[PDB]
């Protein structure tokens, strides 16, 4: 801000930066809660996709575990008529089948009852993104960003006063 | 004329007598055969049942244990963060173990089978030979044996007539 034109240009620069920061309004310490919420929502999605993946392999897919176990049970039927061991094993296989079906059903409940919220997740990511952008210019911490803005505002007022006198 | 007819009748009867005698049907033998057929066929069914189960649960390119295993792995990422998913995954491991254990016992059934494909085929072959005879000379093996006795007697009378015919 040495020459008159330089000062004019400096005034614009400072005003821009103070404006950019004030608009986002970073509050130091806010990222703690954002990060916690980010991981919570991200994990919720992961949990829901896992449960659904298990349901497909166990029950719903064209090829599935319950389906093969059921075929096995049926293949044992004629044998079970003549041999007590096969009869016993067929019966234990039916119980295994019921367990697999019960598990698939409870996994289905997990996926269906999920509190995953993709819009919420996007909002959390958006705020972290706004703060990151400030930190990449005025950082490295939010404390640093806030002080940058405060020093810019003080410098700006000094230059406006200089212009006021000239 | 009637002479040509007699010659042909001699060949007919001789052939029928030979056919029956070569098989040597013993009326009553079918009871034991049928009992043994069921015994062996049933052993075959048991062994085939255990083999099929092993294939579908474990050994087939596509098998139950393999799919359960994939499902267990699919749950990994969810189990990291959710107690309920983690629990279901553990219950699923238990189900997998049960399925593998069952496939193991089935393999033992097949491996220890007293099935005898050799004996079974031989029992069927005898029953088939007896059935073929009953279809021509039956209905029962008793009838078949009687048919052969009468045929042999008739044959002897014709052969004698021929010898008498030529001095």
Swiss-Prot record, chain A:
It comes from the Bacteria. May be involved in recombinational repair of damaged DNA. Belongs to the RecN family. This is DNA repair protein RecN. It comes from Deinococcus radiodurans (strain ATCC 13939 / DSM 20539 / JCM 16871 / CCUG 27074 / LMG 4051 / NBRC 15346 / NCIMB 9279 / VKM B-1422 / R1). The gene is recN.
């Amino acid at each position: 801000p040495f020459t008159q034109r330089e000062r004019a240009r400096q005034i614009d620069l400072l005003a821009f930066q103070v404006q950019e920061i004030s608009e986002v309004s970073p509050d130091p310490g806010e990222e703690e809660g954002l990060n916690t919420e980010l991981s919570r929502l991200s994990n919720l999605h992961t949990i829901a996709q896992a449960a659904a993946g298990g349901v497909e392999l166990l029950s719903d897919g064209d090829l599935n575990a319950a389906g093969l176990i059921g075929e096995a049970v049926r293949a044992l039927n004629a044998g079970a008529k003549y041999d007590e061991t096969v009869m016993q094993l067929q019966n234990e296989l039916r119980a295994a089948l019921e367990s697999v079906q019960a598990i698939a059903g409870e996994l289905r409940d997990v996926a269906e009852g999920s509190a995953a919220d993709p819009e919420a997740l996007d909002r959390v990511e958006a705020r972290l993104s706004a703060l990151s952008k400030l930190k990449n210019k005025y950082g490295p911490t939010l404390e640093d960003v806030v002080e940058f803005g405060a020093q810019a505002a003080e410098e700006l007022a000094g230059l406006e006063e200089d212009e006021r006198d000239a």
